[PDB]
Design a protein around this ligand. Sequence first.
Ligand SMILES: CC(C)CCC[C@@H](C)CCC[C@@H](C)CCC[C@@H](C)CCOC[C@@H](CO)OCC[C@H](C)CCC[C@H](C)CCC[C@H](C)CCCC(C)C
Ligand SMILES: CC(C)CCC[C@@H](C)CCC[C@@H](C)CCC[C@@H](C)CCOC[C@@H](CO)OCC[C@H](C)CCC[C@H](C)CCC[C@H](C)CCCC(C)C
Ligand SMILES: CC(C)CCC[C@@H](C)CCC[C@@H](C)CCC[C@@H](C)CCOC[C@@H](CO)OCC[C@H](C)CCC[C@H](C)CCC[C@H](C)CCCC(C)C
Ligand SMILES: *C/C=C(C)/C=C/C=C(C)/C=C/C1=C(C)CCCC1(C)C
Ligand SMILES: *C/C=C(C)/C=C/C=C(C)/C=C/C1=C(C)CCCC1(C)C
Ligand SMILES: *C/C=C(C)/C=C/C=C(C)/C=C/C1=C(C)CCCC1(C)C
Ligand SMILES: CCCCCCCCCCCCCCC
Ligand SMILES: CCCCCCCCCCCCCC
Ligand SMILES: CCCCCCCCCCCCCC
Ligand SMILES: CCCCCCCCCCCCCC
Ligand SMILES: CCCCCCCCCCCCC
Ligand SMILES: CCCCCCCCCCCCC
Ligand SMILES: CCCCCCCCCCCCC
Ligand SMILES: CCCCCCCCCCC
Ligand SMILES: CCCCCCCCCCC
Ligand SMILES: CCCCCCCCCCC
Ligand SMILES: CCCCCCCCCCC
Ligand SMILES: CCCCCCCCCCC
Ligand SMILES: CCCCCCCCCCC
Ligand SMILES: CCCCCCCCCC
Ligand SMILES: CCCCCCCCCC
Ligand SMILES: CCCCCCCCCC
Ligand SMILES: CCCCCCCCC
Ligand SMILES: CCCCCCCCC
Ligand SMILES: CCCCCCCCC
Ligand SMILES: CCCCCCCC
Ligand SMILES: CCCCCCCC
Ligand SMILES: CCCCCCCC
Ligand SMILES: CCCCCCCC
Ligand SMILES: CCCCCCCC
Ligand SMILES: CCCCCCCC
Ligand SMILES: CCCCCCCC
Ligand SMILES: CCCCCCCC
Ligand SMILES: CCCCCCCC
Ligand SMILES: CCCCCCC
Lengths: 231, 231, 231
Amino acid sequence: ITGRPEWIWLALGTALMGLGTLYFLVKGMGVSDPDAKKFYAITTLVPAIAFTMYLSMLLGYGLTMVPFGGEQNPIYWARYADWLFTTPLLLLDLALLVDADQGTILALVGADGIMIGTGLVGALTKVYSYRFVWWAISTAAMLYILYVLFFGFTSKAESMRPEVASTFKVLRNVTVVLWSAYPVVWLIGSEGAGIVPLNIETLLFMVLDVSAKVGFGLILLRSRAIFGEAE
Amino acid sequence: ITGRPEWIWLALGTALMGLGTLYFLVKGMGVSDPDAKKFYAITTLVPAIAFTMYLSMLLGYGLTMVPFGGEQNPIYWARYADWLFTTPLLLLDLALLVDADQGTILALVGADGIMIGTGLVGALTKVYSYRFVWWAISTAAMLYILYVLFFGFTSKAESMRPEVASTFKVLRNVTVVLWSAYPVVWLIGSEGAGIVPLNIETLLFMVLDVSAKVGFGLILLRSRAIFGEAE
Amino acid sequence: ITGRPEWIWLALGTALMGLGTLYFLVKGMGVSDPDAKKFYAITTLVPAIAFTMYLSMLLGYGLTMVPFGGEQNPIYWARYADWLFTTPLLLLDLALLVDADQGTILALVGADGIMIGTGLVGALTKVYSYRFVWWAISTAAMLYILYVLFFGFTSKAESMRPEVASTFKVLRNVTVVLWSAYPVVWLIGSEGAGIVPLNIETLLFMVLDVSAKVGFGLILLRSRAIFGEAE
Ligand SMILES: CC(C)CCC[C@@H](C)CCC[C@@H](C)CCC[C@@H](C)CCOC[C@@H](CO)OCC[C@H](C)CCC[C@H](C)CCC[C@H](C)CCCC(C)C
Ligand SMILES: CC(C)CCC[C@@H](C)CCC[C@@H](C)CCC[C@@H](C)CCOC[C@@H](CO)OCC[C@H](C)CCC[C@H](C)CCC[C@H](C)CCCC(C)C
Ligand SMILES: CC(C)CCC[C@@H](C)CCC[C@@H](C)CCC[C@@H](C)CCOC[C@@H](CO)OCC[C@H](C)CCC[C@H](C)CCC[C@H](C)CCCC(C)C
Ligand SMILES: *C/C=C(C)/C=C/C=C(C)/C=C/C1=C(C)CCCC1(C)C
Ligand SMILES: *C/C=C(C)/C=C/C=C(C)/C=C/C1=C(C)CCCC1(C)C
Ligand SMILES: *C/C=C(C)/C=C/C=C(C)/C=C/C1=C(C)CCCC1(C)C
Ligand SMILES: CCCCCCCCCCCCCCC
Ligand SMILES: CCCCCCCCCCCCCC
Ligand SMILES: CCCCCCCCCCCCCC
Ligand SMILES: CCCCCCCCCCCCCC
Ligand SMILES: CCCCCCCCCCCCC
Ligand SMILES: CCCCCCCCCCCCC
Ligand SMILES: CCCCCCCCCCCCC
Ligand SMILES: CCCCCCCCCCC
Ligand SMILES: CCCCCCCCCCC
Ligand SMILES: CCCCCCCCCCC
Ligand SMILES: CCCCCCCCCCC
Ligand SMILES: CCCCCCCCCCC
Ligand SMILES: CCCCCCCCCCC
Ligand SMILES: CCCCCCCCCC
Ligand SMILES: CCCCCCCCCC
Ligand SMILES: CCCCCCCCCC
Ligand SMILES: CCCCCCCCC
Ligand SMILES: CCCCCCCCC
Ligand SMILES: CCCCCCCCC
Ligand SMILES: CCCCCCCC
Ligand SMILES: CCCCCCCC
Ligand SMILES: CCCCCCCC
Ligand SMILES: CCCCCCCC
Ligand SMILES: CCCCCCCC
Ligand SMILES: CCCCCCCC
Ligand SMILES: CCCCCCCC
Ligand SMILES: CCCCCCCC
Ligand SMILES: CCCCCCCC
Ligand SMILES: CCCCCCC
């Protein structure tokens, strides 16, 4: 385990997702409101899944070697298994907040699936130049998601409760900034151009992941917006 | 096929899931009620999926060799492919019975996914001691599911029709007893401590599977609880 | 890339799915109706997914070699990854058109999953004779889907708006004819009996895919049936 310099960030990531999971689980114990239960369910599942996949990376299961550039390159494939489930869940949190129509939810989740799936293919592609073709397609899918979060959702929120509008706005901004960093880290890290070494890359992803999941969740679950308006 | 002593239980399992599938399909032919159609759909799909995966194990496709303990260990991975889809379907049957809120359904299905996914990782893990780490996490996810089935669902059922309350109670009890045996069999069988040989392990899983799927389905689909109250 | 004679059909397929995707995306820009948004979302996702998987086949990622018949046989596994997601989406388009009950939708999607999953197992099976066992099970699942599209849906459509009835009828007929060709092509092509060479097989699948996705989508998205009745 300790033979990989990035182990420390995997261990920290595992611990923080674990602690985040336990905290949200305990916090959601005293919740009977059906709307709030949905948000607690979605939001607690996110670090729970991330916990399992961080642990899989820490123990070495979620790592494979991919030959490109005439080298055996360590690729943590478990990230994509995580993101495949957790990024649509995060989008669902946002979509449910603003009472998105079903068509838009399907568009988001579908685009997200394409984003992660093509990122995975890019990560495992042995022809070096083609890795960036997949990166570009995945990034286009991300750009679509970001467009919808801004020019389909933000104007929907203004027509809703002020607490849901303000909470959505914060979470939207957090999401757009944090999510946009991922293709950059991939591009310059071990999966892409290889300018940033894997240990630093792992640190960067860990900071992004904890912020995008536990940070996000802390903001969401402390908000009154997740409760139905009741007396 | 006959070169594996466990083939007989795989063959029997295949036949019983097949027959179970055909029986539920025929039985559901004369059903127009929209609620009953949901239960027939869910409940017929369960042995249909199990049929395909038993057949895959029988024909040898759903088997791989995993090196641990300095041995090549036969691991039937197809079980997890089965359970990944059939256990949430079984939980959906229960959840729909008691008209569970969406948040609770998501919690159940999500926990179930974690249960099966981590069981799969445990099954394929090459570091012997780590297999039991995954077993423990999976078992914790199972315990969460069982907690919800008792302390989130049972009190919901009492507020519903007597036929749905009584049927849920029976199916809940069947589910908790049968499902709890699976981590025990895994732990002592070829995936875990290796005390019980694979042929007996396969027998045990076959008895559990047929009971948890066809047995469960027979109880559910004979009940009046799957029909909306109509005149 | 050009080393495989079928590359031309993969390239054409990629281009046509890409163009189809862009066309539906642009066309759906000026849509606010919640019902129409659902259909645009579903129908645009279908060629988008197919685009990615055609590209994966073109670049060689979505190809593996399967030993059977004492030969190394090129099997494009990416087709199943495509179909796993796009065929239920296509069925959802049809089901939503006729306002299918949830039980029937689950039956369709479930049968479809079995159809594609067993086709995949058949495609990767190393025992030649067993490949056709999987083909038969998959074809039985297809026959179930076709039965439901005719003897569960058609009589539902007649009870609905004339525009939805007529559009459903056309799309149903297109779907039944086109989908039925797939098991035939598989059976006689490289996955099955090997009578038709892979380059021609790839052409046939490309024509079917573009017709079943872009052709289908063009018919659906030009129809008034995807809009709620409004003044
Ligand atoms: C609505 C939305 C959800 C839509 C989703 C968008 C989605 C279509 C985007 C593309 C997803 C697709 C790329 C997933 C591919 C998974 C693949 C990387 C798994 C690894 O297999 C790749 C090679 C080794 O590199 O296997 C060696 C060859 C082996 C023989 C491989 C054979 C097994 C195949 C992998 C079977 C395909 C199953 C499905 C791809 C499962 C989906 C997995 C998940 C990652 C989407
Ligand atoms: C809401 C709920 C549904 C949440 C679900 C909870 C879920 C997160 C729990 C964990 C699921 C995750 C462990 C699934 C892992 C699948 C993996 C075992 C497949 C086999 O690949 C493992 C190694 C060989 O041992 O592959 C050799 C290396 C290869 C290069 C592997 C690369 C391909 C990757 C497998 C791509 C990942 C795709 C997804 C994991 C598909 C999910 C499969 C299913 C089993 C969940
Ligand atoms: C409600 C509906 C959706 C129901 C769906 C119906 C469905 C049950 C029908 C059967 C699906 C099932 C056959 C999928 C099998 C995927 C499998 C082909 C992936 C490739 O792995 C096969 C072998 C190499 O040939 O791997 C070499 C051995 C490796 C060690 C394999 C270990 C990893 C396993 C693949 C883990 C299983 C994960 C799930 C099968 C993911 C589903 C993938 C998708 C194709 C259904
Ligand atoms: C909790 C984890 C999160 C929120 C991860 C989000 C990941 C992304 C937004 C990844 C995007 C990528 C691209 C846009 C292209 C390059 C490859 C990816 C997958 C890193
Ligand atoms: C129809 C099949 C059923 C109902 C199978 C259920 C399986 C489980 C409840 C399995 C649980 C496991 C654990 C709790 C940890 C050990 C590994 C598993 C996957 C066997
Ligand atoms: C857009 C792609 C479409 C509509 C593909 C549809 C594919 C099928 C209907 C495939 C059916 C098969 C069988 C019925 C058995 C043989 C194997 C398959 C998977 C080709
Ligand atoms: C979106 C964040 C991308 C910026 C990443 C900056 C990382 C700087 C770390 C120094 C690079 C290490 C190179 C020498 C080993
Ligand atoms: C490929 C995995 C996609 C599924 C991710 C799980 C989250 C799905 C959320 C469903 C949103 C509801 C749409 C109507
Ligand atoms: C990883 C596979 C999970 C999907 C299993 C299929 C059953 C899902 C049931 C969905 C329940 C509805 C939730 C609102
Ligand atoms: C194995 C992949 C199955 C999921 C395919 C995605 C489409 C699912 C459509 C869901 C229909 C809604 C059912 C209530
Ligand atoms: C085009 C949609 C406008 C809002 C999205 C902001 C785009 C941020 C660019 C991210 C950079 C990724 C490499
Ligand atoms: C803690 C929830 C109470 C109901 C669940 C019963 C737990 C049964 C233990 C199963 C043993 C698994 C090894
Ligand atoms: C049995 C359902 C009647 C409508 C389905 C038509 C069946 C077409 C046969 C397709 C041939 C596949 C090999
Ligand atoms: C070896 C790198 C070759 C450059 C490939 C860049 C492709 C990026 C695609 C963006 C449209
Ligand atoms: C393929 C990238 C798409 C980003 C621009 C958005 C196009 C308009 C979409 C309107 C729903
Ligand atoms: C070789 C066996 C070593 C014991 C591992 C047991 C781990 C179980 C984890 C329960 C918390
Ligand atoms: C991680 C195992 C959880 C089992 C105990 C239940 C904790 C309380 C959950 C309340 C929804
Ligand atoms: C080598 C071919 C052997 C014939 C197998 C055909 C099986 C088809 C199953 C249809 C019930
Ligand atoms: C297993 C093939 C099934 C095709 C015939 C349909 C049987 C009746 C189903 C009624 C819903
Ligand atoms: C509750 C604390 C969870 C921490 C477990 C994972 C940390 C890795 C330690 C090596
Ligand atoms: C309808 C009977 C189904 C039995 C087929 C599978 C049994 C295995 C026989 C070797
Ligand atoms: C918009 C045009 C998309 C075409 C890209 C794929 C075609 C393959 C060219 C070799
Ligand atoms: C992106 C950083 C999130 C900060 C989380 C703090 C939560 C305090 C309520
Ligand atoms: C767990 C055993 C189930 C027994 C099924 C019998 C069904 C008869 C109605
Ligand atoms: C199966 C062929 C479909 C033809 C599509 C033409 C669409 C024109 C409206
Ligand atoms: C990590 C355990 C949380 C302790 C309770 C915090 C207040 C809800
Ligand atoms: C007005 C909301 C600002 C949130 C920005 C957070 C950036 C990490
Ligand atoms: C809208 C601001 C996005 C900032 C992107 C930063 C990526 C590191
Ligand atoms: C396995 C075939 C079932 C025969 C009909 C049973 C009575 C519905
Ligand atoms: C009161 C219901 C009892 C059911 C127990 C079944 C145990 C297998
Ligand atoms: C509530 C009783 C559970 C019994 C567990 C038996 C496991 C073999
Ligand atoms: C492929 C681009 C489509 C151009 C607009 C067509 C009319 C909606
Ligand atoms: C009456 C609808 C006829 C459609 C047939 C299309 C065959 C490809
Ligand atoms: C209902 C007519 C089906 C035609 C099947 C054609 C397959 C090539
Ligand atoms: C909570 C489980 C953590 C396992 C870490 C083992 C190194």
